[PDB]
Design an enzyme around this catalytic site. Structure first.
Site, PDB file in Angstrom:
ATOM      1  N   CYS B 531       0.923  -1.101   0.000  1.00  0.00           N
ATOM      2  CA  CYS B 531       0.000   0.000   0.000  1.00  0.00           C
ATOM      3  C   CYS B 531       0.957   1.141   0.000  1.00  0.00           C
ATOM      4  O   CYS B 531       2.102   0.950  -0.237  1.00  0.00           O
ATOM      5  CB  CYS B 531      -0.805  -0.032   1.302  1.00  0.00           C
ATOM      6  SG  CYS B 531      -1.483   1.497   1.995  1.00  0.00           S
ATOM      7  N   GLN B 532       0.477   2.331   0.285  1.00  0.00           N
ATOM      8  CA  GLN B 532       1.280   3.519   0.378  1.00  0.00           C
ATOM      9  C   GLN B 532       1.802   3.679   1.785  1.00  0.00           C
ATOM     10  O   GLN B 532       2.885   4.226   2.003  1.00  0.00           O
ATOM     11  CB  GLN B 532       0.393   4.720   0.049  1.00  0.00           C
ATOM     12  CG  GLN B 532       1.009   6.116   0.296  1.00  0.00           C
ATOM     13  CD  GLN B 532       1.906   6.554  -0.832  1.00  0.00           C
ATOM     14  OE1 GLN B 532       1.838   6.007  -1.933  1.00  0.00           O
ATOM     15  NE2 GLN B 532       2.779   7.534  -0.558  1.00  0.00           N
TER      16      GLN B 532
END
Ligand SMILES: Cc1cc2nc3c(=O)[nH]c(=O)nc-3n(C[C@H](O)[C@H](O)[C@H](O)COP(=O)(O)OP(=O)(O)OC[C@H]3O[C@@H](n4cnc5c(N)ncnc54)[C@H](O)[C@@H]3O)c2cc1C
Ligand SMILES: Cc1cc2nc3c(=O)[nH]c(=O)nc-3n(C[C@H](O)[C@H](O)[C@H](O)COP(=O)(O)OP(=O)(O)OC[C@H]3O[C@@H](n4cnc5c(N)ncnc54)[C@H](O)[C@@H]3O)c2cc1C
Ligand SMILES: CC(C)(COP(=O)(O)OP(=O)(O)OC[C@H]1O[C@@H](n2cnc3c(N)ncnc32)[C@H](O)[C@@H]1OP(=O)(O)O)[C@@H](O)C(=O)NCCC(=O)NCCS
Ligand SMILES: CC(C)(COP(=O)(O)OP(=O)(O)OC[C@H]1O[C@@H](n2cnc3c(N)ncnc32)[C@H](O)[C@@H]1OP(=O)(O)O)[C@@H](O)C(=O)NCCC(=O)NCCS
Lengths: 565, 565
Positions: B531-532
């Site tokens: 994910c970020q």
């Protein structure tokens, strides 16, 4: 295949739904929300009314569609569960779209219906200009009354969190406000003398704060006359949806354009009662630590349940989102047999009050008295960060504890800066089973812009500890006005400070001159000593006992006292 | 009675002196300070250089006269103790006024001489334009060079707290600045990847940061030509006190008008080692936990002492104010037979770096490896308060713990807001003996302008606990660059986000399509997911693991990685 049904889709429900999916792909999860939106930010509702929260899109954090794509969870909005039949394991649901009904089966159920604003048994309180607030539609009606009724005076009734936030929002829209509270203070989590700082901040804003006052009666009057420019009148101060005349407990009369009901909340118990699930003594759904209702297939969480106070172990009602979320996640856990237990509620809270923050955790002086727990308490007024760096604000902070065992009962804090920091340090301190003597040894972050050499938490610690060890001897703000004949009152502030307030007939010897002028005080009297905030006072007390005087020091100083008046 | 002598009159000495008077009125108390000032705000020196702290007087919190009036301690300034005769219970003092000396006797003695700045063996480094910062006169000299040499470019050596603070302070003053560190990061208490955020913020200010590089030589050349307006020369950019030419370890030259030396400090041990007192392996004075040197009539506190590390039991040297003060007070207690024991040092630190605060408590990743302690680590990037309320800031937070026992080793946080709060919380918690499972049940203060339903810490707790229990499986930033062909790299961000940085070769299936698109990922490979920030990744991980894939989630997502070089 597990079939899980979830009643209510906000803090409790939705936290459970997401966790349940993270823990199983095979499970069927259906979430009923009676209103239009799930996962909304109940907490920000007043911040949108003020415009502080600009876009209402910000208040919806998940959607039926987001919950389906992310978590394969069926949300049904505008479906109200209208009965549970346990034996059968079926709910009966109505579609508010059209009044039609259906039933859905379940393996396990979670109830998370929240709590509804109290409506007080007050003549004519149900009218078009009177609103509660728990959700967006409640907010829209508030919003719609402000525009339709051209609101210029408004009355909030209730000095808890919501009511204080509502009062502040209306102020921000430039509306004259009256707040009324039956009790002798706003924010009951803190004690009255702490509330005092909030009281002045409110008054200083031109808010008209009436404490110890009730709304007796509401008369609502429809407006029969439309002023117009065509007719040479002034349309600026018109109220076309009408007018309210309030009657107060003291016979007085208040003329207002809008009335906000924020006197607290009461658990949605109706479904549970109808289904024969056990309700505790406080009007909330009974649950065990797991958190099962009296039916093991049905859990309940959130504002609807009674939970265990951390300190006392007694049942308590605490409508807070943090516990709701975390309960809701735990309930998922237990649906899959994890057998996790919830560890009690400290009632940690905070509220913004114009430039102030008022917060608290654990137990207050009120609640400790009314349960016959012996306690002692301390006050400090120390800078939020190193005083030599600009932007320090005075943190006023009360700590309540067991005078013998050292137990931490509660703490409270009011100030312009660093209040949340201090209530959290305390909340973890007390949850971890620390005692005041151990607080002394805390090592927190000190750089000139963030903290101090010794943090308020460190200074409170020393002060309570000196009292536990016999190294200091308290007298409090409420015992100093009745003084015996073998007691002398000593003001150890400098003379320039007396103009700001003092106590009648006190003798004034400034601390820095005391050692030299001690012989001026009779050793046959008990010396009762007060600084501005406690600290010089304790220097004097040590000088004196060290020379064999009996003495006491005014805890928390003239400050604590002044703001109690 | 009792005759008490104190060597040094600041954080250690003065805390001792004041506490000691509060305990006894009969003791003689004399406190030697070699400088002119006592109870000075060492920590404010950089902030007065910038003018942030406007007034010189704000830096002096006590005086010889204040100390005599309030506490009746005899403060002798400009008196430097030059010997201790333990057998005789005599010290030898030199009056710096005229170099005369005199003996003074003690019942008990207290050492609080502090720590000198380090003198690096550098050719030429002692010269009129290079300065260290320990006290008020050093402060004045720096100001004097700034003014008289018209400093327009200045160099700082040292990337620790004081270094960062002078770098910042000179920047506030308009001066183009350079900072040099030998290590591969500033602020060693946190770890390189955490320091990463600070490096970025420092460079964003137009500061020239050169990590991993030392000063090899200083050539100081005096100015011989005084530009004149009478001569029709431009006088704007003159430095009449001269110029510095620095040669760096990589051969490169650096031209500058002032050089600030901030490469750490080293304990004042001379007096201690001349008198035969025990010295520890790290080069500071050895004490027991009661603060006694190996002569039990002699206490020592502060920067010169080696203290007992909270987490390991081992010796450490940590030059901090909070500890020094509290050590000093307890030393006073112990001199009156109270036998209180110090309870170890966590290393709790925090430092402003432009808009950021960088802080820590406990042990860092470097310290743990180097001591052969097994650990795991969690990263989290949570908002400082509920996102929907204006002014949230990303709080990047590292948690270090034991993966089996749940022991809390340390925590670090970097960001624009709420860092001091999350570091204080961790400190209390670790010093209360909490474990990570237990962090999950914290109840911190939530209102929209101050916290979240689940705080930074609650989230960090869920993350590490999930790994503790095998509900998660990590991979870290340093591991994801070395992948095997058993492993498939999967990016669960949305297509739009890939524009802002990515890992080459990754398959993109955004989490919200993953359930429907899962069959596209071969079940014969282990899916390495990012994910970020970590969050959407942990959702993807739960989906896959739940459908029998083998998976790891990249902890701290692309954001942690981004800032790790
Ligand atoms: C104005 C306001 C400000 C607040 N500020 C804070 C704050 O700063 N900090 C804090 O900690 N807390 C705050 N709170 C409280 C927090 O909102 C609640 O504690 C939390 O939302 C409780 O969650 P819950 O799941 O029990 O119930 P709710 O949030 O009330 O959600 C319950 C939902 O269940 C639904 N429901 C009820 N009956 C049915 C039915 N039979 N069928 C289907 N659905 C049903 C309801 O429609 C409701 O939407 C605030 C609350 C309000 C109203
Ligand atoms: C610029 C700067 C910024 C800092 N910022 C922070 C911060 O943000 N947070 C934090 O926690 N800490 C900070 N510190 C560190 C903090 O100042 C020290 O940890 C603390 O002062 C240690 O106290 P001490 O009593 O051991 O030493 P000192 O404060 O150095 O006091 C010792 C005194 O004894 C005198 N003396 C020495 N030898 C003799 C002798 N033999 N005879 C007579 N007198 C003697 C010395 O001149 C000195 O004045 C900072 C320090 C500096 C320099
Ligand atoms: C938002 C909502 C749906 C919760 O869903 P959620 O997905 O469980 O909530 P979060 O975004 O906080 O996710 C937390 C999860 O992310 C994980 N996590 C958080 N940050 C992470 C990171 N950077 N890396 C890896 N995992 C992380 C946590 O472990 C946790 O999962 P877990 O319970 O499996 O351990 C629910 O709280 C909600 O409806 N809230 C809005 C309404 C509300 O709370 N109202 C009250 C009044 S304000
Ligand atoms: C100021 C200094 C001389 C110590 O003076 P001090 O009187 O002991 O410390 P404080 O001003 O914090 O007061 C502490 C005392 O007040 C008491 N106290 C604090 N607030 C109180 C309150 N409102 N009511 C009653 N008592 C209070 C505390 O218990 C403590 O007394 P105790 O140790 O007897 O229990 C010393 O800390 C110093 O020289 N500081 C400057 C040097 C320094 O810290 N800098 C290094 C880098 S910044």
């Amino acid at each position: 295949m597990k079939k899980i049904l979830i009643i209510g889709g906000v803090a409790g429900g939705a936290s459970a739904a997401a966790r349940a999916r993270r823990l199983s792909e095979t499970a069927e999860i259906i979430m009923f929300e009676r209103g239009e939106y799930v996962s909304f930010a109940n907490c920000g509702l007043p911040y949108h009314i003020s415009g502080e929260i600009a876009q209402r899109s910000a208040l919806v954090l998940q959607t039926p569609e987001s919950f389906k794509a992310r978590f394969n969870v069926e949300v049904r909005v505008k479906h109200e569960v209208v009965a549970i039949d346990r034996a059968a394991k079926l709910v009966t649901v109505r579609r508010l779209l059209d009044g039609s009904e259906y039933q859905e089966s379940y393996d396990t159920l979670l109830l998370s219906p929240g709590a509804a604003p109290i409506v007080p048994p007050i003549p004519g309180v149900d009218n078009p200009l009177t609103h509660s607030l728990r959700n967006i539609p409640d907010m829209d009606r508030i919003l719609q009354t402000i525009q339709m009724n051209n609101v210029e005076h408004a009355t909030v009734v209730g000095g808890g969190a919501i009511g204080l936030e509502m009062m502040e929002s209306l102020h921000h829209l430039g509306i004259k406000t009256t707040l009324l509270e039956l009790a002798d203070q706003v924010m009951t989590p803190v004690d009255r003398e702490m509330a005092g700082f909030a009281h002045q901040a409110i008054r200083d804003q031109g808010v008209d704060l009436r404490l110890g006052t009730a709304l007796s009666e509401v008369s609502y009057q429809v407006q029969t006359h439309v002023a117009s420019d065509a007719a040479g009148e002034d349309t600026a101060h018109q109220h076309i949806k009408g007018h309210l005349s309030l009657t107060l407990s003291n016979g007085e009369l208040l003329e207002t354009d809008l009335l906000i009901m924020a006197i607290g909340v009461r658990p949605e118990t109706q479904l549970a009662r109808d289904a024969g699930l056990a309700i505790g003594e406080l009007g909330g759904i009974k649950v065990n630590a797991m958190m099962q209702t009296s039916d093991p297939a049905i859990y309940a969480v959130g504002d609807a349940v009674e939970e265990q106070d951390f300190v006392t172990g007694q049942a308590c009602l605490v409508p807070l989102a943090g516990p709701a979320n975390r309960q809701g996640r735990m309930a998922a856990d237990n649906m899959f047999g994890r057998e996790e237990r919830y560890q009690g509620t400290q009632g940690t809270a905070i509220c913004k009050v114009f430039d102030l923050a008022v917060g608290a955790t654990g137990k207050n002086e009120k609640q400790l008295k009314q349960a016959g727990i012996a306690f002692e308490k301390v006050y400090v007024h120390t800078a939020s960060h190193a005083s030599y760096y600009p932007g320090a604000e005075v943190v006023s902070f009360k700590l309540l504890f067991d005078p013998v065992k050292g137990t931490i009962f509660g703490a409270q804090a009011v100030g312009k800066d660093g209040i949340d920091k201090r209530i959290d340090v305390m909340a973890v301190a007390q949850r971890a089973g620390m005692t005041v003597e151990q607080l002394q040894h805390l090592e927190l972050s000190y750089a000139p812009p963030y903290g101090s050499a010794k943090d308020v938490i460190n200074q409170a610690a020393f002060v309570a500890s000196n009292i536990i060890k016999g190294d200091a001897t308290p007298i409090h703000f409420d015992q100093i006005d009745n003084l015996s004949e073998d007691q002398l009152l000593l003001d150890v502030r400098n003379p320039g400070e007396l103009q700001n307030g003092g106590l009648e007939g006190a003798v004034n010897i400034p601390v820095d001159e005391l050692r030299d002028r001690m012989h001026e005080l009779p050793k046959d009297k008990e010396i009762i000593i007060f600084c501005q905030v406690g600290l010089r006072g304790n220097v004097a007390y040590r000088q004196l006992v060290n020379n064999g005087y009996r003495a006491r020091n005014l805890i928390g100083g003239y400050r604590t006292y002044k703001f109690a008046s």
